[PDB]
Ligand binder design. Structure first.
Ligand code: A1ANT
Ligand code: A1ANT
Ligand code: A1ANT
Lengths: 132, 133, 135
């Protein structure tokens, strides 16, 4: 895991499986902007707003939503998935992204979106950097 | 460029990502016959019926279908991919064919399958000729 | 036919255009070591680990990567290029290596990296040997 310098993330999406009442739109947009800033400092810029950002409920929504993403957004590079703690959703994310569709997926715990820290944003960058 | 003489396309497939309701079997068979004729006349004959011809929908279908093709038809030379206009399918077809599986692919817009003209068939032949030549 | 004696391959690189998911690090390291062994037995020893070993994707990556290689690794003798099969990358590799930069490049199919046999390693040795011998 030597860090890669050449990465640019142009097309990406957010799928929020945490409840909106806990993880609101402002929490998500705040999170997005802070993630963009750190990714820029590290020389793996996330350009742009996500091309898609929706709430969803249930592990069974993962495959349909990811197929939808792949089928709708040309060149989609990354899906960031927000999770409400321990969940069957995580398992469903992993199999679909890593073994079915071959698309980079990164999960994040809702609590790190509600109150973001540079350390957790850094962790997410490093993981994305490895994946991409 | 230079056109290449002496190419023969013996094993080829059609993957149609345009909806069947717009691009029916008879449209595809008619298209195939016209392509056969012009390619023969130009001395790069696309010989025979395709070894495979199936509909699919979505960029997500590309990799599974092409893995199937690669694994089932040894000596597959070409996949002709019919596209429904602007689509994430094109990008995925190029990624899978050129990078993932290593398979020659030529895309064609559905509107040129629904009504063929000599000029669009010629375009397609020349592209195939360059790719396989 | 005409195998060349007395060649030593000291500076060489691997550029893998097959996806990592298909052609993993262990596949590449295993392939490298097997290639070194047979090439040593045949008297064209690969003296070291490659100076560079990276994944890349797309014909558009070829020229930049090869320029990097040429400019960074003095006396680079060989680039081994792993390809998934028929691909516009093959054409671009030949154009850039043979006409743009002038460095010896040898392509190999991903399936022969994933699982080696003595016969396919031998094939690749002979081709490397031919390209490197000369004035
Ligand atoms: C089991 C479980 C785990 N997590 C954590 O969230 C992502 C983080 O790490 P990750 O898996 O993303 O780490 P990674 O090495 O990049 O590998 P994968 O993401 O491909 O699995 C993981 O530790 C949850 O939030 N909920 C859960 O229920
Ligand atoms: C860039 C782009 C192009 N097209 C056009 O539709 C078929 C035609 O095919 P093309 O002659 O380009 O040949 P192709 O097999 O697409 O591949 P190349 O070998 O030219 O790269 C291509 O120009 C799309 O439908 N979507 C796109 O996003
Ligand atoms: C489909 C495919 C096949 N092969 C075969 O494997 C050895 C030999 O090698 P190739 O003649 O293709 O290429 P090469 O030695 O670098 O030769 P030159 O182009 O310098 O003559 C070629 O017959 C590839 O290597 N790459 C492929 O993708």
């Amino acid at each position: 895991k030597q860090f890669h310098t050449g990465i640019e993330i142009k097309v990406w999406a957010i799928a929020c499986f945490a409840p909106q009442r806990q993880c609101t739109e402002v929490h998500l947009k705040s999170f997005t902007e802070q993630l963009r800033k750190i990714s820029r400092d590290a020389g793996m810029p996330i350009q742009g707003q996500p091309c898609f950002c929706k709430y969803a409920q249930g592990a069974d929504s993962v495959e349909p939503m990811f197929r939808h993403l792949k089928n709708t957004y040309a060149g989609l590079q990354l899906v960031v998935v927000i999770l409400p703690g321990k969940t069957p959703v995580y398992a469903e994310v992993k199999r679909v992204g890593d073994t079915v569709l071959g698309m980079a997926t990164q999960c994040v715990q809702m609590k790190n979106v509600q109150r973001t820290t540079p350390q957790t944003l850094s962790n997410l960058c490093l993981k994305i950097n490895v994946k991409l």
